Structure 1
Amino acid sequence: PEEVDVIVCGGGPAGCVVAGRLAYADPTLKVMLIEGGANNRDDPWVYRPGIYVRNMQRNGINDKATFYTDTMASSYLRGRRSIVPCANILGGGSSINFQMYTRASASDWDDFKTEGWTCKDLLPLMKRLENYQKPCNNDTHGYDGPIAISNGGQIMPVAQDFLRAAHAIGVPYSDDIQDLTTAHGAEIWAKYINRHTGRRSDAATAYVHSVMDVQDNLFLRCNARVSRVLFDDNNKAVGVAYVPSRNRTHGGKLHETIVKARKMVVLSSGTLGTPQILERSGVGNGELLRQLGIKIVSDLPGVGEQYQDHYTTLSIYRVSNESITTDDFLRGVKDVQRELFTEWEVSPEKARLSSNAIDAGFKIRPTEEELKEMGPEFNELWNRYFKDKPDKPVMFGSIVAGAYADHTLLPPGKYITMFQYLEYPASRGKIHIKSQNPYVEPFFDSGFMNNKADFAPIRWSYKKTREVARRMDAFRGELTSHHPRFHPASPAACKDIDIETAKQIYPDGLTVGIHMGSWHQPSEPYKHDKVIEDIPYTEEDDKAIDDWVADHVETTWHSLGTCAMKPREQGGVVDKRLNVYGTQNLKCVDLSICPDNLGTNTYSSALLVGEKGADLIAEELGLKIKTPHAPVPHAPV
């Protein structure tokens, strides 16, 4: 058509819930979901979980991601221009992400300090979205929601190996680290995978294609980049203008098509996308819009400010050749890939590919002792933010059964990577547009490590995750190339592959065991007997780690906080009901609205914001949300 009731802009977790719930709640209500990227419906490069890694390739084929590079270099990162991707496909992150089922701790929601948003307030909505298909010992999960959650088809022998090691350095085992209370414990790590079908638990098939298969009131435009919201003379959002995904017209001319809104315009276009739409619509910092030739609808300085992410570091460790890992599949060995593709088709329920291979991990929190060696600047964050907040973790740590790094830069053999990220950083960034044009790259700043308090925890994490690695059965060495630049004589210096493992990789190789060049100090072969003591570290080694953090820290795609929800005088952008200040009929509901960070992989969060926004809109339209939701394609119920 040209006109409908609710327009949802962006087809991410949040957007898919809003559009899907409202369209099901009332079949009269015409809602249209507009998404920049492509439709994901029945795409074997979405619904199969194991091929997740490739959606982060800058290979000029991958069209499922937009890559946001920093405008200028950062001193704090020793001169590098940070890259932050995000989804360009229906589903958003849910079509391309690691599928790690994590949840925030309880206090995180209370620290929003906003009525409607306590843990207490959201707990029932949390249960409403979840389809929990694994055991636990608490009452904290839901069992008839759309989003299937499990340990997946098969757990890799390294998972329990990681756990055995975590126990040995005094992290306790728990059945569920996602019970809203835990900050220091270790688990088998669940996925957004259906235990029964082997399929990825995307938001689009759960909430949108579910509804489109049974009713005719839900409209979908994919390959459609929403330029701006259309405004009234009294600032009521009337409609929405989108352009084609490609800029491939005659003479590169703009081609806007307009769609009009009777009731609501919803901005679910992501932490990076949403502030851009608001800013080119005329809703942002007044100084910026003036210069850009944009008439001011509302003057909001915090639009596109306070960029919060999680700060990833990837410690990589060499493992035994008998170890089962993803590396040969990731390199694209032919009949490795044929085997796992065939195994998934025949038996999704036991298939290796029905997993993300991130099968174990922990949330961690430092000791009275450990806090002494983490510097003054972090201790000030601790006393203020953490000290009397026992349910908040400081670092995340998981085991990927394979290298998560360009294998074109990795030696042969088997790897595991320790996937770490900083939970509540103090650093902050920003994103502003440089034009009315919706094809120009915007100004961008990661803001990674611009606060000094963020080094001490990551450094701590490096030494900790390493003490685990060294205590595992599968461990053979540290990939020197991808590790800190310790001094060769420091006791903390790396030790690379041992000779027995090397010889196994190239049994007829002429180069194995040639000392010439002294490029590594090899490990002594594996002894199951070996007694192990913690690696000592000097102030020198601690500089080396910091330097390593500044050169190799990255985004975790856990982007939030650019349209913050807090009072307008503080800088915030939305009401408690997520209305953009000084407009009518306009709400921003996605991770943009977070005023404060969460201790979690953020698919659970984006969904929960999406459930809450559906509640708020539904009681504003006098509509009642159905439970359960429409039956979800390819699922037994």
Structure 2
Amino acid sequence: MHIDNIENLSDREFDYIVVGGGSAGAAVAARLSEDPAVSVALVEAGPDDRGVPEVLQLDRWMELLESGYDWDYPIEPQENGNSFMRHARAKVMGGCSSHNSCIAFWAPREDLDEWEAKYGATGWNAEAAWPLYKRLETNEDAGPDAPHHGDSGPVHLMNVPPKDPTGVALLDACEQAGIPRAKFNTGTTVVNGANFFQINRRADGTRSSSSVSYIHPIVEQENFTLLTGLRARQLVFDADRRCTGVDIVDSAFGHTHRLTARNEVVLSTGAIDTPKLLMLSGIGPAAHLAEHGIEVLVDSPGVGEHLQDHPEGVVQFEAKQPMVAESTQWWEIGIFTPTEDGLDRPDLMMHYGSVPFDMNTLRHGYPTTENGFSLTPNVTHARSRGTVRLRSRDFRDKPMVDPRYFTDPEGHDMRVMVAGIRKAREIAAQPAMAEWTGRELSPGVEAQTDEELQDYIRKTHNTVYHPVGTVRMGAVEDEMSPLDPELRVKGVTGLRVADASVMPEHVTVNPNITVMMIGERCADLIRSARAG
């Protein structure tokens, strides 16, 4: 059952409590609940999404940013980036799989195999992931000549039909620039290729969010309790350092209530909120906790460290003809291309949007339009590393999020981004786009030198909205990895984390489907542990 008033819940004890109903957390709770002998609670600070058309209808997703469904995290001042940038994060069942543009990718096998081979995370490789991406999806390309794909899973993946004539022309321009059309999600990584995306959307226009796909079917299930509108303020531990449950706060008076777990708590509040909850709960860098008056239960110095993202630039053009008035999600094409030789994954990706994107350019005086399109280059393995830290001991205060954009010492991220703006220009200038590409509105053709393009990037960049890696998994003996390879929080028992916080290195592509696969894997790890 769904409980949106804690006063109506009499028994506050469960076998498992999953905190955060987002991409991973919805997957973990649904899968755990498939054993009818265990009880599962899923606790989510935002509201239920059932019946909320602006969340459910994918083509409305742009309206959600900065609304009441967005926690809206500003960043710390940036040494070499855009201090006005905001990390939008959904506050609603489904988490960010409920606010995003549903671009759906399997991660490159080369990214996943490196989690075990290079970063110490035993058992995390493409062998472990592939059957889980298969189990979670119902893909339109499934069939016996593509046996890796799922045809039965709860998350529906479909091909964006090629209806936007500007997008067809842009892919024709990609081909003229030496970037062929490529099929996505075949299991073979695309290093140089472009196409319309696969999106996790249902045939009726509803986003196949983790809440739509995993939770809506099971709300009334006997052993399942969904609690919305309830915000966790700390995890609690007995004198054995065993996690016994979570303290949550209601929206009426801000009273604190305890939910208790007999077996395990899984924390899935995402890459910004998870490290903050662990630190509030005494698990984090000792001197940082002591400076906020928090008693250190585990000195765990990698909590909040290693923050990674896909930083993003934009090139905006005025369109020479009326742009499409309807769309699946307004950002229907992706282009991958390598900026140097010898790579087995592309270092550069770009999105094509059939809209302008002036959120960061208008304040610096760049001209804008109501009829244009955008190309957004992003660095796929940015080398910069940032932090999520407590702003105070009060759980109500937003944390300090400092991605340290464009600070890596070799200057890789700024180099790939400058190459990305040039590449976007070269694509838009091909003869197949000649009836569409009008004047370049940002940065504008006056910006030509590396220095002019770097200044533009520093002032106007955004994010593809993909923060990961702040509570990473790694080797049992690696003290900078807060989790072991079974996603258990080191130094306590009964506590795992499953969300985008766990990645030891960013993936090449948009990460949502991989985060759901992390939730699927966490459920399998728990169910195996329960058997013993």
Q: TM-score, structure 2 length as denominator?
A: 0.91
Which of 398, 402, 415 in structure 1 is aligned with 2:351? Answer: 398
* Residue 100 (structure 2) pairs with residue 97 (structure 1): yes
Any conservation in 2 of the 1:321–1:413 contact (CA below 8 Å)? no
Deviation at 1:41, TM superposition (A): 1.3
Give the Cα–Cα distance (whole angstroms) in 2 for the partners of residues 554 and 447 of structure 1: 13
Alpha carbons 1:132, 1:149 under 8 Å: kept = yes
Taking the aligned partners of 1:168 and 1:119, their CA distance within structure 2 comes to: 34
Which residue of structure 2 aligns with residue 450 of structure 1?
Answer: 407
1:429 partnered with 2:412:
no
Deviations, residues 497-553 of structure 1 (Å, cap 9, x unaligned): xxxxxxxxxxxxxxxxxxxxxxxxxxxxxxxxxxxxxxxx5xxx1111111111111
2:126 aligned with 1:122: no
The 4+ residue runs of structure 1 with deviation greater than 6 A are none
Aligned match of 1:604 = 513
Instruction: Indicate the residue corresponding to 1:468 in structure 2.
Output: 427
Structure 1 unaligned blocks of 5 or more: 326-351, 369-386, 485-491, 495-536, 624-637
What does 1:264-343 correspond to in 2, within 5 Å? 264-325=264-325
CA distance change for structure 1 residues 569 and 135 in 2, over 3 Å: closer, same or farther? closer
Q: 1:466 to 1:14 in 2, by over 3 A?
A: same
Per the alignment, do residues 407 and 460 of structure 1 end up closer, same or farther by CA in structure 2, a change over 3 Å counting? Answer: closer
CA–CA distance in structure 2, aligned partners of residues 320 and 477 of structure 1: 5
Deviation track 1:299-344 (CA, whole Å, cap 9, x = no partner) reads: 101101111011111211111233324xxxxxxxxxxxxxxxxxxx
C-alpha distance 444-358 of structure 1, shift in aligned 2 (>3 A): closer
> CA shift at 1:419, angstroms?
2.2
Q: Residue 18 of structure 2 aligns with which residue? A: 8
In structure 2, the residue corresponding to 1:322 is in which secondary structure?
A: coil
Residue identity opposite 2:139 in structure 1: Y
How far does residue 288 in structure 1 lie from its aligned partner after superposition?
1.6
Report the Cα offset of residue 467 of structure 1: 1.2
2:375 is the counterpart of 1:364? no
How much has 1:228 moved relative to structure 2?
0.8
Structure 1 residue matching 2:148: 3-state secondary structure = coil
Q: Which runs of 5+ in 2 are unaligned?
A: 1-10
- Root-mean-square deviation over aligned CA pairs: 2.1
CA distance in 2, matches of 1:164, 1:366: 20
Q: 1:38 to 1:408 in 2, by over 3 A?
A: farther
Q: Which amino acid aligns with 1:130?
A: E
Q: Give SS of 1:323's match.
A: coil
Question: Which of 39, 51, 58 is equivalent to 2:60?
Answer: 51
Give the letter aligned to residue 604 of structure 1. Answer: I
Q: Is this contact kept in 1: 2:237–2:243, CA < 8 A?
A: yes
Which string of whole-angstrom CA distances, capped at 9 and with x for unpartnered residues, describes residues 201-245 of structure 1? 1101211121124x2211111111101111011110011101135
Write the mapping of 1:157-172 to structure 2, written as runs, cut at 5 A: 157-172=165-180
Following TM superposition, by how much is the alpha carbon of 1:570 offset from its aligned partner in structure 2, in angstroms? Answer: 4.5
* Equivalent residues, number: 508
Structure 2 equivalent of residue 225 of structure 1: 231
Is 1:477 aligned to residue 438 of structure 2?
A: yes
Which residue number corresponds to residue 65 of structure 1?
70
1:194-213 to 2 correspondences below 5 Å: 194=202, 196-213=203-220
CA distance in 2, matches of 1:177, 1:420: 20
Matches within 5 A, 1:237-252: 237-245=243-251, 249=253
2:500 pairs with 1:493: no
Cα pair 1:106 1:391 within 8 Å, conserved? no
Contact 2:160 2:196 in 1 (8 A): no
Instruction: Give the structure 1 partner of residue 109 of structure 2.
Output: 106
Q: How far off is 1:138 after superposition? A: 4.0
Residue 86 of structure 1 is matched in structure 2 by 89
- Work out whether residues 136 and 153 of structure 2, in 8 Å CA contact, stay in contact via their aligned partners in 1: yes
Q: Measure how far apart 1:177 and its partner are.
A: 5.7
Show CA shifts across 1:459-483 (max 9, x none): 1110111111122144342343x31
- Residues 387-446 of structure 1, C-alpha deviation per residue, up to 9 Å, x if partnerless? 4xx431101112111123359956444111112211000001101113332111222212
CA distance in 1, matches of 2:435, 2:486: 51
Find the aligned partners of 2:369 and 2:478 in 1 and give their Cα distance.
Answer: 56
Q: Using structure 1 for the length normalisation, give the TM-score.
A: 0.76
Residue 187 of structure 1: which of 195, 211, 225 is its match? Answer: 195
Distance 1:210 1:474, change over 3 A: farther
State the one-letter code of the partner of 1:39. D
1:34 aligns with one of 39, 43, 51: 43
**Rg larger in structure:** 1
- Within a 5 Å distance, the mapping from 1:522-533 to structure 2 comes to none
Deviations 1:317-372 (A, max 9, x none): 111233324xxxxxxxxxxxxxxxxxxxxxxxxxx45x11322221111245xxxx
Deviation of 1:84 (Å): 1.5
